[PDB]
Amino acid sequence: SMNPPPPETSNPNKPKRQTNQLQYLLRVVLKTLWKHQFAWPFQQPVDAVKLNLPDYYKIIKTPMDMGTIKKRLENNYYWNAQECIQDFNTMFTNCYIYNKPGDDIVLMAEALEKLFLQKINELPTE
Ligand SMILES: O=C(Nc1ccc(C(F)(F)F)cc1)Nc1ccc(S(=O)(=O)N2CCC[C@H]2CN2CCOCC2)cc1
């Protein structure tokens, strides 16, 4: 059993831009979600070997997690805030598609997503 390589977090050819919106996504959004009691399943790429989920990467073809987002924000990977917001939305959607309603992991993702959406609604103006 094998995990895929993680999503890209370093690419010297990709143009980068530090924006006040991206700064908010790191210092407010990511740091708040990271400390949440339900953050732990989402703090690193899904380890389908360790978690005995051998079909995970057969079903989920755009994996994303907050460990990768944290690296992308701290290492200035992005050009705009929308790219980072899409990463969070992908992470949540993966969990909803792979698991079933009623699963504890889905209740955890739903709690984090409610927090995320509240914070995104207060994304500062550029
Ligand atoms: O599936 C999704 N989204 C989603 C799916 C597919 C796609 C796709 F990619 F296809 F487009 C995109 C997004 N979300 C979600 C589903 C069930 C629960 S639930 O089972 O936990 N449950 C039942 C109803 C609400 C909840 C009860 N909550 C208890 C605590 O108080 C608040 C409500 C939680 C979240």
Curated annotation (Swiss-Prot):
Site (Acetylated histone binding) residue list: 99
Annotated ranges, domain Bromo: 17-123
Location of the protein in the cell: Nucleus; Chromosome
Superkingdom in the source lineage: Eukaryota
Tissue-specificity statement: Ubiquitously expressed.
Per UniProt, location of the Glycyl lysine isopeptide (Lys-Gly) (interchain with G-Cter in SUMO2) cross-link in this chain: 58
Post-translational modification comment from the UniProt entry: Phosphorylation by CK2 disrupt the intramolecular binding between the bromo domain 2 and the NPS region and promotes binding between the NPS and the BID regions, leading to activate the protein and promote binding to acetylated histones. In absence of phosphorylation, BRD4 does not localize to p53/TP53 target gene promoters, phosphorylation promoting recruitment to p53/TP53 target promoters.
Subunit structure: Interacts with p53/TP53; the interaction is direct. Interacts (via CTD region) with CDK9 and CCNT1, acting as an associated component of P-TEFb complex. Interacts with RELA (when acetylated at 'Lys-310'). Interacts (via NET domain) with NSD3, CHD4, BICRA and ATAD5. The interaction with BICRA bridges BRD4 to the GBAF complex. Interacts (via NET domain) with JMJD6 (via JmjC and N-terminal domains); the interaction is stronger in presence of ssRNA and recruits JMJD6 on distal enhancers. Interacts with NSD3. Interacts with NIPBL.
Function: Chromatin reader protein that recognizes and binds acetylated histones and plays a key role in transmission of epigenetic memory across cell divisions and transcription regulation. Remains associated with acetylated chromatin throughout the entire cell cycle and provides epigenetic memory for postmitotic G1 gene transcription by preserving acetylated chromatin status and maintaining high-order chromatin structure. During interphase, plays a key role in regulating the transcription of signal-inducible genes by associating with the P-TEFb complex and recruiting it to promoters.
Domain free text: The NET domain mediates interaction with a number of chromatin proteins involved in transcription regulation (NSD3, JMJD6, CHD4, GLTSCR1 and ATAD5).
Misc remark: JQ1, a thieno-triazolo-1,4-diazepine derivative, and I-BET, a benzodiazepine derivative, have been tested on tumors with success. Treatment with GSK1210151A (I-BET151, a I-BET derivative) has strong effets on mixed lineage leukemia and promotes myeloid differentiation and leukemia stem-cell depletion.
Disease note: Cornelia de Lange syndrome 6: A form of Cornelia de Lange syndrome, a clinically heterogeneous developmental disorder associated with malformations affecting multiple systems. It is characterized by facial dysmorphisms, abnormal hands and feet, growth delay, cognitive retardation, hirsutism, gastroesophageal dysfunction and cardiac, ophthalmologic and genitourinary anomalies. CDLS6 inheritance is autosomal dominant. A chromosomal aberration involving BRD4 is found in a rare, aggressive, and lethal carcinoma arising in midline organs of young people. Translocation t(15;19)(q14;p13) with NUTM1 which produces a BRD4-NUTM1 fusion protein.
Similarity comment: family membership: Belongs to the BET family.
Stated name of the protein: Bromodomain-containing protein 4
Organism: Homo sapiens
Highest classification ranks of the organism: Eukaryota, Metazoa, Chordata, Craniata, Vertebrata
